Symmetry: D2
Subunit: 389 residues, 4 copies
């Protein structure tokens, strides 16, 4: 069978404790679900299932994916569930939703990801009681999202391991960072994000605020990156500038068979040709996209040179430089409008975020063969190949 | 294609703050993952992916499914992720794992569920700061697992609504409870749970303790159940006895193609013929399995009378009577060895728990056509049809 | 015997989460202790005991009064302790320190009060453990400082009771408020607070900041005060403007016998002639100063008309108007430089704050007979009479 | 003037999380206040002021001393306040109340101490917000009661400093421990605690329980105490047996002039002749009573040999041996009925607890000149001399 992406939308990537500081994840997910239905002309009463990836759902209630679907207008007859493959969750939900229609068990799937790292609460197991002494209040964002459970240190330390393993100097990593900021700043000015971004209405008590611009996009220079202190180790290279930040947002895509799009007169953004996921050593989780993209290309029967456009998520400057240096694809086609270093890294939603950036990127310049991939904590990677119709 | 279940295992369902009081979820998941590999003769280096459902992973670290696979012995080459469809998570992971091999994207899948409601922490959003006044510490088990996010009350209140519409007397619900305990009492005595249960070693500081028996099995009487006070409403019918409890445990199943099983000389427990999931009104979420089982049966080409054994999860006595009364299947084949009212309700693992109980019961008494289904909070249901080889 | 006040000092009253947001109470107290020693020519090695009132010391460590004395330079040979009579703590410590020298058990006492309501933590009894359900995180400032333990409502409700019992209109309370702001702002412009205020250096990571002005002194308007909604009752008269705020600060005074001051050539600010404390009904705790000041005046043998200057703490506009209406003293001599409505209300330190304001105003204009008094939560009041040497 | 102790009472010292696990301090204080009034024939409407020492009042509400007086029956006209000199609060409150009558400002004072270390909550300053990362939940009992704010370690470490500097072997410390337990067991068997102890009725949901016996009194052996591991240092000498525990309780005494007692026909337990408090190095806070008792004896004009009975609080076995070795008084008259090692150490109430034990023992065996003293955290000590009428 053939599965296409009829429409795709995403909210503007918000800053940590920024515009979406007090906005739950499912409310951001409800906006993109309603948006992909409007952009494709499909009614809510036709969605079979909603698949939204989310890593930090603590305190939001029973199944925020169902809450997002019901709030967006999807009726009670449909189903919904959340998945967690860390950073590659947003892209795997699209592949999982692709398999739902592939196995003949569904006809229309709204799949994507949503994440609100600002609303992540602090937790502590208190059922057994604390008879005496102090106890830690654990940050769910850091513990369940940003710390490798096998070695105990942050994901930035795994980037330091990649930097030591590939011999990536502080100047070479900062040079890759400023390139991402310069490509993202030009894209926001030229309006290359307006098609992907659906405006979100932050309902506040002191009036309403419309968010329709990635607020983590700033202007960095090569000298403003050499003054940043290392954020993870006292003798390291990864700083707050050459590393992706903590962000909120949501993204989704409307999936359907290739015959259904022709029946509805829908012109899909692209067709899902192949997907893949492979694991690596958690010490060097940043090398995840290397065998994942090659396995995706191997299943699609495509060479690396056949690709016309690449979206490789920039979790860190060290991991992004190695993947580009190793795969050897033309860096002029990788993250043409910037990357997660300049846009943001909403863990649950970043998988579908770079998919939105890629799908509209293939349409805007006439690219035919695209590829999106991300690195995953704990030593994993996911990749998907998209062809234009 | 054809997907079979080569092996299945489950831990004993532990009580709230009982044997697994201080045991993380992924440790229980590691035992079942390693068990299904031993019972089938498949090495750990052959698992492509691990799909484990889990509702309450707060404070356990990055992707507890990955931690369970690595601790069980699954190498770094494989991938892993967690899913959340509330109570139907344990069963949907099997269907999702079936689709991985169906689409030719995987060869060996270890799928199931794990949940540790005792290790569920209390949380509170504290990033924005508390300027003044008291703030609540939210229990993640109740909030993210046992409260409908659309009406705000407990799952027990939804059972009262099902009881009001289906005319289920106070005595008729207690009669279903004692029937579940008496069938569970006979199953534990006759040893019909020893094959499915894999022993877990609770390593404590005062020696080691082996857990290989469901510690929630007691002897209930009809008069000891009519004196229980309603635990959810001041004037109701749902009590602590006729409702599922808070429990810990894990369960899984090894998935593989039917040709691969014959090539390895494995005798599969059964073949996955059909699956389905549909949503219902959140007011009567206990009626989830009603439209789900018919959709699963219609895809398999089976009549309702064709089933030889049924495992319908007993979230509440009210919901179980309604699901049985509407489909009209012979009550002698539903939960022959007892149900969740007497065994326990590990949210993430209950979907695969009743699958293990069904698979080993179908094999020991020669049943050919089986069906497992559960109700899901928020108004959903999941069902799977299994045939024996 | 005769006990005089050789010197007195106070820190600038800081706003809630303002200049002293991250400054512990004992650090503010150490500055005032060092100040009263410099202004009197007495060394730190001569202080026999340090008595500092403090209402909210939770989480600050063992006996913050001892920490303030040690940090200020008082040697280990001396003693120190903290007391708690709520809002009258700052003034009762002076009377208690006066009794130390009166009974011949001490010769030089540094007495006063300190409070940091911004550093008040949230607490919860967790030793018995929370098996199930949510639990409240109790604000120590609200619970242990601003809530009557006999009727359960805020201290602002007791002001409403005083307003209802004394028939104090909303316009009369706001008129008293703007009068307090105008007297304090004009006093701050004319520099009538520089003598009392000792500058505090808030050592922050982004440089040092000197605080030498009560930062809650603002310009209020009658129309900007009549639009404020009542903060305690939905249909009431006490608002955030006509009520004292939550504030941080410290104040103290160096006590010594009248003969020792003449031996040291010190000109004391005043002599403590009489003191008194009496209790009232907790429903109308604002009437505390009424029988306390009358008992203090009778012990000194003074009539109400004999007073030349009065400092009656303005906890609320309702409580302050009632005290003036009952005692009947000339309002032109009460709070000449403003009150707690415009300066601030650090509960533990407010008792010594108005003492500093009274002592320095009596000295500059030649007043001989003064009286300071405050209302106390739970239905109490404290008052002290000061005569000039 | 002359101030006598007309009556005295105390609650049984409860164990940590024991009989008084859920009993607030002021409820224990209300029982002792009512008890000292009945034993002297004085009504509650005659008490001028209530002075209760308390170290851990976090979360109990506004001024727990006021709550204890009101619940015991003291009318609203009277006043009440709490003081905090750590371990010397219970005894210094008696001295402060003695000075109230000495300066002619009061006639009848109910003074003592109360402490409920089991009800001590965990706290954390959360107004400024936790931007990122984990934060500790501070135990108010450990932080504000048992940790030296100048060196950061527990009070047990100060005992280790005393033990190393005074040449006190670990076996000599354990030998002092069993002597305290054996003297307490014999005193409890012979009923020498019945006069001082007033029964407390713990009102629980499962019926009422009368507590009239110190539940921390057990039978210890020399070999069961020499096998205990040091609780403060990994290679130390202070164990859980030779150190005082965490306990709850309350104690008080009714103070009045010697002439007023004769007017009422009251036979006082003793007359307060002298009191004193002096500070020492916080490194060796256990040596507090050494210069404090010498100063108290010098104010009374008594030599050490003039004492007939001594109550020296046993905070630790190391500090108690050093105080006896330096002062050189006959150990046969010190703690005849046992000490805090076997009875308990309620911080706020220990000062008045050993006062009750001293007052009733001096009366029962005819002792004339007595002395009570305790060591105080942060490097202080307090002592009081009592003579018989
Ligand atoms: C690195 C990290 C800790 C930054 O945390 P942060 O401090 O709250 O973010 P900030 O923007 O405040 O960075 C701190 C400083 O750097 C500055 N800064 C950020 N980006 C900059 C840039 N491009 N140029 C210059 N300065 C920059 C900030 O303005 C700030 O200024 P300050 O010195 O006054 O504080 C966070 O982004 C991170 O850990 N990212 C990786 C997390 C993650 O998702 N890992 C998994 C990926 S798979
Ligand atoms: C978990 C649950 C049992 C809570 O009841 P509970 O009040 O917390 O149970 P308790 O903590 O009071 O302790 C268990 C009590 O039940 C009693 N009990 C348990 N099984 C019993 C039996 N078979 N016969 C008689 N009494 C029994 C115990 O003796 C105890 O009595 P007690 O209250 O006097 O001490 C249940 O009411 C519930 O809330 N389930 C929610 C989980 C859920 O939603 N499942 C469906 C998912 S859709
Ligand atoms: C009354 C109380 C709850 C105020 O709470 P608060 O909101 O945190 O204090 P605020 O100053 O921030 O009041 C908030 C609003 O009122 C405004 N406001 C405050 N004082 C004002 C004034 N004098 N004129 C005009 N506006 C004023 C603030 O600017 C703010 O407006 P905005 O936030 O809408 O822009 C608090 O001050 C209080 O409870 N005090 C009681 C003290 C007490 O009990 N003492 C012991 C009694 S013995
Ligand atoms: C010493 C201290 C750390 C121990 O706390 P604790 O361990 O909770 O006290 P416990 O009652 O639980 O004693 C626990 C252990 O010691 C043993 N123990 C206690 N008292 C004993 C005794 N009298 N004889 C023999 N063994 C004893 C217990 O049985 C247990 O050993 P176990 O593991 O074999 O069961 C704690 O009491 C403390 O900090 N005390 C200091 C109090 C203080 O500083 N007061 C102020 C003085 S200035
Ligand atoms: Cl002196
Ligand atoms: Cl009197």
């Amino acid at each position: 069978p053939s599965i296409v992406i009829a429409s795709a939308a995403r909210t503007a990537v918000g800053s940590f404790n920024g515009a979406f500081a007090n906005t739950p994840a499912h409310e951001l997910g409800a906006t993109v679900i309603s948006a992909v239905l409007e952009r494709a002309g499909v009614a809510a009463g036709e969605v079979n299932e909603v698949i939204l990836g989310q890593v930090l759902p603590a305190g939001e209630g029973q199944n925020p994916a169902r809450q997002a679907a019901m709030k967006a207008g999807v009726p009670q007859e449909a189903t919904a569930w959340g998945m967690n493959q860390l950073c590659g969750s947003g892209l795997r939900a699209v592949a999982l939703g692709m398999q739902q229609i592939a196995t003949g068990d569904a006809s229309i799937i709204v799949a994507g990801g949503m994440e609100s790292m600002s609303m992540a609460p602090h937790c502590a197991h208190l059922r057994g009681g604390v008879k005496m002494g102090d106890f830690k209040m654990i940050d769910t964002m850091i513990k369940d999202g940003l710390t490798d459970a096998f070695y105990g240190y942050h994901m930035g330390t795994t980037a330091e391991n990649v930097a030591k393993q590939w011999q990536l100097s502080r100047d070479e990593q900062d040079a890759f960072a400023v390139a991402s900021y310069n490509k993202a700043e030009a894209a926001q000015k030229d309006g290359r994000f307006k098609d992907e971004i659906v405006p979100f209405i932050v309902k506040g008590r002191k009036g309403d605020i419309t968010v329709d611009a990635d607020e983590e996009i700033r202007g960095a220079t090569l000298d403003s990156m050499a003054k940043l202190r290392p954020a993870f180790d006292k003798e390291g290279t990864v700083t707050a500038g050459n590393a992706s930040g903590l962000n909120d947002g949501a993204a989704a895509a409307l999936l359907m068979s290739e015959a259904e799009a022709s029946r509805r007169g829908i012109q899909p953004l692209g067709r899902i040709v192949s997907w893949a996921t492979v694991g690596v050593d958690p010490k060097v989780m940043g090398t995840g996209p290397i065998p994942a993209s090659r396995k995706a290309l191997e299943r699609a029967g495509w060479k690396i040179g056949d690709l016309d456009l690449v979206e490789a998520n920039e979790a860190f400057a060290a991991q992004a430089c190695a993947v580009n240096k190793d795969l050897g694809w033309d860096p002029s086609i990788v993250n043409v409008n910037g990357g997660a270093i300049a846009i943001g890294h909403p863990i649950g939603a970043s998988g579908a975020r770079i998919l939105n950036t890629l799908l509209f990127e293939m349409k805007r310049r006439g690219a035919r063969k695209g590829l999106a991939t991300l690195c995953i904590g704990g030593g994993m990677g996911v990749a998907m190949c998209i062809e234009s119709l």
